C-alpha cells in the first residue's frame, strides 16, 4: 500500500463533499478499496505473508459493513459508489 | 580470553579472574543439552 | 516448467513433458542451421561400435558459439529457441557489427537483454569473461579448459559451477560432479547457470518416446546365451555372477581413469 | 541516539572481556540499554570493537 497523506486527501476530495470529510462512508469505502488493491498486489509477490492476509480480510469486512450501512440508509448512494469503484464481483 | 601477565600471586590472580569470568559455569552448562522449556521453567522458578 | 499429461491412455498415464514456457520463436535462423546426418552407432568402417542408437526424428544442427571471441562488441538477445541437439535452450544474438550467433541460454536471460564478452564486460548473466576478471563466489557455466579453445565444461541443462578461490595463474572451481579442480585464469566462463533446469523432471511415459529420441532397446546380459555374453546361460533364471560387460570388464567399482594421467595434478578433490 | 562510532564512549558499558554489562550493574533504563546494545553490536559488525 503506497499510501500517503496526499493520496488520502485526493481520495477524500474525489469522494464525499469537501476534502476535510475523511469520515464519510464513501470516503472510507474508497480508501478501503484502494489499499485492498495494493495489498493484493503485495501478496501476489509475498505469497507467504499470512499477516498481510487476514489484514486484507479485515479490510474487506470493514468495507462490507460500510456498504451494508449504505444499504440501510441510502440505496442510491450505494449504487453510485459501487458503480464508480467497480466493487461487485 | 583471560590474560594474566606476569608465582603464587600470579596463580591466585589467574584463578580469581577465571572465577569472575565464569568459564567453568558455562562449560558445565554446555556439557549437556537443555530444552528451551526446561530453561524457561528454571528461570521462572528462580 | 513441466506439463503433466492426464491419464487418458496407459502410455500417457506417467508422461511428464516440458511446458516450453521460455521459448519465444519456433523457426531457427536459416544461416545458422544445417541438416545433420545420423549414425546408427556405426563408425567409418561401417561396423556398429556403439549399440542402442538408431532412428528417431530428423534433426538440423545449430551452430553454437562456444568460443565468444567478439570481445567488446555488444549483442542483443533476439529469441529463445528450442534446440533438438542439447538439453538446454539456445539464444539468438544480434551484434552491433551485424553478425549473428547462437549461445547456450542461461537461466534468467530474457529477450531484449544485452550481452558482451571480454575483460571489460560487466559480470552480468550472459556475459563471457576471463576467469581472472570474475568475482570470487560467482555461479558460472560454459568454462574453457584451454584459452581460446571454446567452452567445454559446464553445458548441460540446469548445471552450474562455482569459482571458490583464486591462486595466481589458476583459479579453483567446484564442478557439477563435486570435483574441485584448478583452471587457468585466462580461460573464459559465462556468468549464470544453464537454464531449463526442469529438464530432469520429465518422464517419457512410453517406449515410443525413446524411439523418437533415437534410442534402441537395450538387452540384459543374463537373458543371452554364454556365447554372446559372459553373464548369459543357465536353466531358468540365474544371477549371472559378478556383473561385467561382454569383454569381462567389472561393472561395480573398478576404476578406469588412467592412473598416470597428467591432469590429476590440477584435481584437488575427486568425486564421480 | 547513541552512535555506533565513538568506540571509546562505547567501552563505558563493557567489561574487561569486551562483553556487554547488565542493566542492573549500571544505571541505564531499558530504552537506553537497548540502544547501547544495538550500538555495540553495530560497531562489532563494523570491526570497531572486538568480538572477544
Amino acid at each position: 500500500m503506497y499510501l500517503d497523506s496526499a493520496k488520502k486527501a485526493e481520495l477524500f476530495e474525489k469522494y464525499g463533499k469537501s476534502v476535510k470529510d475523511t469520515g464519510s462512508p464513501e470516503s472510507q469505502i474508497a480508501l478501503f478499496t484502494f489499499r485492498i488493491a495494493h495489498l493484493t498486489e503485495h501478496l501476489r509477490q509475498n505469497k507467504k505473508d499470512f499477516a498481510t492476509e487476514r489484514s486484507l480480510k479485515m479490510l474487506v469486512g470493514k468495507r462490507r459493513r460500510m456498504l451494508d450501512y449504505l444499504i440501510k440508509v441510502d440505496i442510491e448512494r450505494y449504487r453510485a459508489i459501487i458503480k464508480e469503484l467497480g466493487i461487485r464481483r | 580470553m583471560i590474560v594474566v601477565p606476569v608465582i603464587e600471586r600470579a596463580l591466585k590472580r589467574f584463578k580469581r579472574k577465571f572465577e569472575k569470568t565464569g568459564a567453568v559455569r558455562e562449560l558445565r552448562a554446555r556439557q549437556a543439552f537443555e530444552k528451551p522449556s526446561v530453561a524457561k521453567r528454571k528461570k521462572m522458578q528462580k | 516448467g513441466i506439463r503433466k499429461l492426464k491419464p487418458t491412455t496407459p502410455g500417457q498415464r506417467h508422461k511428464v513433458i516440458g511446458a516450453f514456457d521460455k521459448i519465444t520463436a519456433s523457426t531457427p535462423e536459416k544461416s545458422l542451421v544445417v541438416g545433420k546426418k545420423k549414425t546408427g552407432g556405426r563408425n567409418n568402417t561401417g561396423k556398429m561400435t556403439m549399440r542402442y542408437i538408431g532412428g528417431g526424428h530428423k534433426q538440423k544442427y545449430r551452430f553454437i558459439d562456444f568460443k565468444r571471441t567478439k570481445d567488446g562488441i555488444p549483442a542483443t538477445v533476439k529469441t529463445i529457441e528450442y534446440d533438438p541437439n542439447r538439453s538446454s535452450r539456445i539464444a539468438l544474438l544480434y551484434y552491433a557489427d551485424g553478425a549473428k550467433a547462437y549461445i547456450i541460454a542461461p537461466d534468467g536471460l530474457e529477450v531484449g537483454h544485452t550481452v558482451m564478452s571480454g575483460s571489460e564486460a560487466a559480470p552480468e548473466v550472459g556475459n563471457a569473461l576471463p576467469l581472472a576478471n570474475i568475482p570470487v563466489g560467482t555461479i558460472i557455466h560454459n568454462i574453457e579448459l584451454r584459452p581460446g579453445q571454446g567452452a567445454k565444461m559446464v553445458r548441460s541443462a540446469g548445471s552450474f559451477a562455482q569459482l571458490t578461490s583464486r591462486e595466481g595463474t589458476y583459479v579453483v572451481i567446484k564442478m557439477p560432479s563435486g570435483e574441485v579442480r584448478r583452471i587457468l585464469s585466462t580461460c573464459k566462463a559465462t556468468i549464470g547457470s544453464v537454464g531449463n533446469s526442469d529438464h530432469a523432471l520429465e518422464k517419457s511415459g512410453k517406449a515410443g518416446r525413446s524411439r523418437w529420441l533415437g534410442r534402441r532397446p537395450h538387452n540384459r546380459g543374463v537373458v543371452m546365451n554364454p556365447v554372446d555374453h559372459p553373464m548369459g546361460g543357465g536353466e531358468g533364471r540365474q544371477s549371472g555372477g559378478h556383473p561385467r560387460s561382454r569383454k569381462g570388464l567389472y561393472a561395480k567399482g573398478l576404476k578406469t581413469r588412467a592412473p598416470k594421467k597428467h591432469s590429476s595434478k590440477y584435481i584437488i578433490e575427486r568425486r564421480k | 541516539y547513541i552512535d555506533y562510532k565513538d568506540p571509546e564512549f562505547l567501552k563505558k558499558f563493557l567489561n574487561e572481556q569486551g562483553k556487554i554489562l547488565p542493566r542492573r550493574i549500571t544505571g541505564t533504563s531499558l530504552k537506553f540499554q537497548r540502544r547501547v546494545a544495538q550500538a555495540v553490536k553495530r560497531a562489532r559488525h563494523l570491526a570497531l570493537l572486538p568480538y572477544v
Binding site: - | - | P135, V136 | R44, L46, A47
Partner: protein, 107 residues
C-alpha cells in the same frame, strides 16, 4: 527523501590515487542512481579490532546521503562486485539520528 549513512573499509594496500578512484566510483554510482550527498568523510588508516581477510589494518570511509529507497540494492551489488572492499554497512537514520548527525557535522 530518506537519510542513509554507509561506512565501508578498504584494504590498506592501495594508495591515495586508488582511494580517490574507488570513493569517486561509489559517489558517482550514487549520483547516477539519483542520490544527493550530505557529507563524505575519511577516517584513514585504523587498526581493526579483529583481522579481516588475514589483514589487521583498514581504511575507513563514511558517506551520509539522501536517496530513494531503491538505490540501496544497487549499491550493495556494486560493493559485492568490487574485490577491493572487504566490509561495508549501511543504516537508515531516523529523525533523531539525523539530528545527531547534523550536530556532529556542525561541530
Amino acid at each position: 527523501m530518506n537519510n542513509y549513512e554507509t561506512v565501508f573499509i578498504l584494504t590498506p594496500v592501495l594508495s591515495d590515487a586508488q582511494m580517490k578512484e574507488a570513493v569517486d566510483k561509489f559517489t558517482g554510482l550514487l549520483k547516477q542512481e539519483g542520490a544527493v550527498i550530505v557529507n563524505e568523510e575519511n577516517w584513514g588508516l585504523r587498526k581493526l579490532a579483529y583481522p579481516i581477510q588475514k589483514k589487521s589494518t583498514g581504511f575507513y570511509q563514511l558517506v551520509e546521503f539522501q536517496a530513494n529507497p531503491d538505490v540501496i540494492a544497487k549499491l550493495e551489488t556494486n560493493f559485492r562486485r568490487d574485490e577491493r572492499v572487504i566490509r561495508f554497512l549501511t543504516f537508515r537514520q531516523d529523525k533523531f539520528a539525523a539530528e545527531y548527525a547534523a550536530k556532529r557535522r556542525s561541530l
